[PDB]
């Protein structure tokens, strides 16, 4: 089980598969100026996964962050790095991540984001 680190490009997955139950991942992503994905703007966010399933034909990914909504660049950011083509459309400043795996959840806001791709699904129980 592999996570990655550092300047995000086209390609990159945050993980290399899907990891093993109850396991919760931490993300922080920090954009620069103009950091654009599929044309959209990026700003920064730390997300903790505590699941991704597939629901219907979406993946649905269950997270803790620390802004009260995601845009849809941030979701697209998070979720297409949860793919095995990785990241795509994305251009600009370039974009950090810190991905870790954490004990246990610490954000304040629980979102439940979704997109019509095939993302690494791993239960919260």
């Given at each position: ?60 990914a ?14 697209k950011?998070?979720?297409?790095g949860?793919?095995?083509?990785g ?16 004990p ?12 019509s ?7 919260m129980?």
């Amino acid at each position: 089980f592999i996570m990655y680190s550092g300047t995000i490009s086209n390609g990159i997955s945050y993980v290399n598969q899907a990891p093993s139950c109850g396991t919760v991942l931490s993300l922080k992503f920090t954009p620069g100026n103009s950091s654009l994905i599929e044309n959209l703007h990026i700003e920064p966010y730390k997300v903790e996964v505590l699941k991704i399933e597939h629901v219907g034909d979406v993946s649905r990914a269950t997270l803790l962050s620390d802004i009260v909504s995601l845009s849809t660049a941030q979701k697209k950011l998070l979720l297409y790095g949860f793919t095995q083509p990785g990241v795509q459309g994305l251009t600009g400043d370039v974009v950090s991540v810190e991905t870790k795996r954490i004990p246990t959840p610490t954000q304040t806001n629980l979102l439940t984001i979704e997109d019509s791709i095939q993302c690494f699904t791993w239960d919260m129980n």
